[PDB]
Amino acid sequence: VTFLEKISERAKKLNKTIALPETEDIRTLQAAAKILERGIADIVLVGNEADIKALAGDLDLSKAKIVDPKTYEKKDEYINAFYELRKHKGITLENAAEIMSDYVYFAVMMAKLGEVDGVVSGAAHSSSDTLRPAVQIVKTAKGAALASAFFIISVPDCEYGSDGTFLFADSGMVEMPSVEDVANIAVISAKTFELLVQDVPKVAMLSYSTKGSAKSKLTEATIASTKLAQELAPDIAIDGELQVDAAIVPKVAASKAPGSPVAGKANVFIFPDLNCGNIAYKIAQRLAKAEAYGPITQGLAKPINDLSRGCSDEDIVGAVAITCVQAAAQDK
Amino acid sequence: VTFLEKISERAKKLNKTIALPETEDIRTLQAAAKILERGIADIVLVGNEADIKALAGDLDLSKAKIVDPKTYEKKDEYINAFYELRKHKGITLENAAEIMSDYVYFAVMMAKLGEVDGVVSGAAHSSSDTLRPAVQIVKTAKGAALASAFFIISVPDCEYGSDGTFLFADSGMVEMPSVEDVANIAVISAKTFELLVQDVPKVAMLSYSTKGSAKSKLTEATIASTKLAQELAPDIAIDGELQVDAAIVPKVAASKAPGSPVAGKANVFIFPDLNCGNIAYKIAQRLAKAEAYGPITQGLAKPINDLSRGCSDEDIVGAVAITCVQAAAQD
């Protein structure tokens, strides 16, 4: 019944391998044990194997694979690769070697080169410390997408959305997205929504204006983002410049935005910027009592996810499941 | 308890008269009926009386007073008055006559000359068409640095705010407020929250950042508005650059904004602009199932309030109540 339960189950039927670089935190090892036992994924622990066996104790980690960044066969391939990416930003080959000794950095490079389908981390690292290797190493830029954070949001007795479930448009990362940024966030978000919720995405480019009902510089940005996004992905339902009520309430839709592909039915909210996106998600979580999952990152070439530093070991398990399912989209 | 009952209560003990010009829209007449029956206020309906009787039907509006702008005794006084105001902006006396035939314009001129203590409109008109007569006829108050609009919002099973009740920082008018504008809106909103909710205002300058957790052009704007507002009104509890969770949730307030006059207890949300504001309000209303009254303006010489075009007749009732209460301040 619960969103997280659909994901974990889906994850088992899939056969993805996720890397866990924080092997000097118990929660990581506790979560791995439960993951391997429950069949959720195959696991690569990045760290010292002697040191892991000594921290693990009673935990059954026999099914996992241990990769030590300072002895692994492909070490030189991984340093060269990071050197190539970072070469023109003041990184020398010897710097790369040093930077590529960090477990997180090494794990992200494993997803980049195919040994692993995604990475989960952040129990024992700042958000920006997690984001940095992701952005530097796994970065994608082939088309209509941009790295961003989103939330899945499940409102309790809710008739709107996909059975009360929505995705929110960068409620946790890109602070001041440009017009293009917003367009691109809208497209990638439709794909994420489709993959994670398994329902037809209906994207609403939010505003205080519904359809020329008001006009300003903020209103023009939203409209311009809508039109660009419609060009970028004409096969997705995207309607633009919509207030929340016109976006999700059929009766409102009927007066303010009659005959729209999205108005009245919206299940994806795209925000003008992080002020709105963060404020909207908090209001939904706290005043609407919604369950919120995030921040989950999207827009990367491989799924790398960040965790709350106060996460529980069950929090890590869930995160692995979601990552595995995002790995389903990015197939081959 | 419903905010409607409470604001409907104080409004009863006051004895104010509100004009309702949108008489060709059922919701107005349905609301008028409930108002007059519940004893909330005296009402003037501005329109054609024959037309209203026909549209009203079974609704009891006998207690109300109907004023037709095209037959009213003082019609000429009202035309002359608007002509004086608008005289030097290219309006002829004949133009005045035509403009002053509009129901809303006339209702606004009624509050200006004393026949009425306030107006409520906007169920059947754009926000900017509701504001225009206010701005031209009543104009801005003397103290007030600017007019702005807001929403009282009451969330159902809510432990946060003032028994689930909040005031939202221009979720219905000023589209792109400057740093000074945001500061001034914070201050005036504090006094409005105090008047209408009857509780200590705890003003939160909203953001995606909590207390230096992030840094950007948007973040500095919020902090600068915070600091200005603290200078404009040092006796008010205003803390700045807070995420919604740190603003209202004691446990998050404890970690992200320790020892703050506001964090954990906020009951007034001030937004960076109308995008956040309007989006925030609709989300509270439709996802949190909150009751939502407004946008209510502040800073005019007389209470002229707006409505959501998708309001219920009961929303109009609540708006008339608040209008009445605002009119008690302004003697």
Look at residues B128, B78, B119 and name the one whose alpha carbon lies nearest to residue B100: B78
Cβ(A167)–Cβ(A248) under 8 Å? no
Rg (CA), chain A: 21
Cβ(A320)–Cβ(A31) under 8 Å? yes
| Whole-angstrom distance, CA of residue A22 vs CA of residue A106 | 11
Please provide the DSSP assignment of A7-74 as one string. Answer: HHHHHHHS--EEEE--TTSHHHHHHHHHHHHHTS-EEEEES-HHHHHHHHTT---TTSEEE-TTT-TT
Residues A7 and A47 in one domain: yes
Range of the domain at B116: 1-139+301-331
Residues B134 and B151 in one domain: no
- Name the region of A198 (left: φ>0; alpha: ψ -120 to 50; beta: rest): left
Contacts of A245 in chain B (CB under 8 A): 282, 285-286, 310
What sign has the CA pseudo-torsion A8, A13, A16, A17? positive
When divided into structural domains, chain A yields a total of 2
Q: How many beta carbons lie within 10 A of that of residue B135, not counting itself?
A: 16
| Whole-angstrom distance, CA of residue A250 vs CA of residue A252 | 5
Which technique?
X-ray
| Whole-angstrom distance, CA of residue A140 vs CA of residue A134 | 10
Are the beta carbons of B279 and A284 separated by less than 8 Å?
no
Residues B155 and B281 in one domain: yes
**Residue pointed to by tokens 């009543």:** B138
Contacts of B157 in chain A (CB under 8 A): 289
| Whole-angstrom distance, CA of residue B171 vs CA of residue A325 | 38
| Whole-angstrom distance, CA of residue B306 vs CA of residue B129 | 10
Residues B290 and B148 in one domain: yes
Residues B197 and B270 in one domain: yes
Residues B4 and B134 in one domain: yes
Residues A214 and A306 in one domain: no
Residues A157 and A211 in one domain: yes
Are the beta carbons of B286 and A217 separated by less than 8 Å?
no
Kindly state the helix (H) or strand (E) to which residue A204 belongs, with its residue range: strand A202-206
| Contacting residues for B239 by C-beta, under 8 A, at least 6 apart | B203, B204, B205, B226, B257, B260, B261, B262, B263
- B251 interfacial to chain A (CB closer than 8 Å): no
Q: What is the CATH number of the domain that holds A107?
A: 3.40.50.10950
Residue of B nearest to A255 (CA): B310
**To one decimal place, what's the resolution in Å?**
2.7
Residues B134 and B218 in one domain: no
Size of interface A-B (CB pairs under 8 A): 130
Q: Name the β-bridge partners of B293.
A: B152
Are the beta carbons of A213 and B126 separated by less than 8 Å?
yes
Q: What is the CATH number of the domain that holds A178?
A: 3.40.50.10750
Residues B117 and B128 in one domain: yes
Residues A290 and A214 in one domain: yes
Cβ(B313)–Cβ(B27) under 8 Å? yes
Are the beta carbons of A176 and B216 separated by less than 8 Å?
yes
Which amino acid is residue A319, in one-letter code? A
| Whole-angstrom distance, CA of residue B24 vs CA of residue B133 | 19
Which amino acid is residue B13, in one-letter code? K
Residues A96 and A161 in one domain: no
Q: Nearest 5°: phi and psi at B270?
A: -110, 120
CA distances from A209 to A6, A246, B204, B302, B309 (A): 36, 10, 24, 27, 12
Helix (H, G, I), strand (E, B) or coil at B261: coil
